[PDB]
């Protein structure tokens, strides 16, 4: 199937004393593989998956060098933005940045992206074409004009279409036994009596990867959303994911209801029905 590499960066200013907190995380698909935390002892980019541990010292030295450069960019950006928005030195503010690349089923470049936010709102982002910028306000508009004249999009596009994809393909191969494996959801249904006359059926999907999944309830072969509840997909902590969907039904009518599970790891969607 298709694959992505993404890096996420967060910097939070700390007015009372010292420098911003900076946290960077790298993912392949839904697997974290690297991290940097300004509060941690190593002051290095660190491995978070076994398949990245084989990279040699040149790699770790380079990633550490780059990630520190990102940290210092975010530190000056916080100051630039405080000035652009006429804010005082007293309050904490946040920058967030995400970038990376998607490949399709055949490993060719599909999409790239680079987005930046201030205080949890859009600031500036590269357009899908990787050629121009979407600026949310007049501060970001001044950023856009500067970055246009300096050819910032062009240099980012070359990374996103080129070296980003190349590294993604390298990681997919090195990590193949997990990164190129789908884990289909392990599914079951529970039943609970809610009153004398009603019951709750809950359809569980467990231990799946990747995270993307769809759970839907049908009654008499038609989709039902009334009297349902669907929890957001949550990490199990072992690299897989979990989700459930529940429906309240008249006691005795459980057989009319079916839970439908769609996932990349299933050749065909599953249908579950209450059978005890």
């Amino acid at each position: 199937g298709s694959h992505s590499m993404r890096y996420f960066f967060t910097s939070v200013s700390r007015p009372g004393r010292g420098e911003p907190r900076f946290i960077a995380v790298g993912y392949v698909d839904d697997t974290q593989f690297v991290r940097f935390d300004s509060d941690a002892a190593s002051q290095r980019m660190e491995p978070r998956a076994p398949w990245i541990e084989q990279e040699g010292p040149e790699y770790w030295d380079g990633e550490t060098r780059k990630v520190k450069a990102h940290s210092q960019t975010h530190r000056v950006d916080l100051g630039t933005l405080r000035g652009y928005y006429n804010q005082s030195e007293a309050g904490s503010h946040t920058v967030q940045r995400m970038y990376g690349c998607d490949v399709g089923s055949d490993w060719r470049f599909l999409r790239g992206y680079h987005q930046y936010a201030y205080d949890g709102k859009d600031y500036i982002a590269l357009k899908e074409d990787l050629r121009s910028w979407t600026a949310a306000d007049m501060a970001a508009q001044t950023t856009k004009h500067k970055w246009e004249a300096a050819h910032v999009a062009e240099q980012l596009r070359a990374y996103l279409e080129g070296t980003c994809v190349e590294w993604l393909r390298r990681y997919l191969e090195n990590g193949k036994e997990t990164l190129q494996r789908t884990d289909a959801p392990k599914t079951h249904m529970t039943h609970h009596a809610v009153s004398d006359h009603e019951a709750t059926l809950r359809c569980w999907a467990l231990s799946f990867y990747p995270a993307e999944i769809t759970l839907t309830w049908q009654r008499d072969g038609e989709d039902q959303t009334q009297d349902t509840e669907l929890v957001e997909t949550r990490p199990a902590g072992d690299g897989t994911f979990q989700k459930w969907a529940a429906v309240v039904v008249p006691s005795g009518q459980e057989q009319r209801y079916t839970c439908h599970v769609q996932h990349e790891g299933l050749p065909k969607p599953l249908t579950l029905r209450w059978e005890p």
Partner: peptide, 9 residues
């Protein structure tokens, strides 16, 4: 691998 030439605001 990280991008090598991030631009500041």
């Amino acid at each position: 691998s990280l991008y090598n030439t991030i631009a500041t605001l």
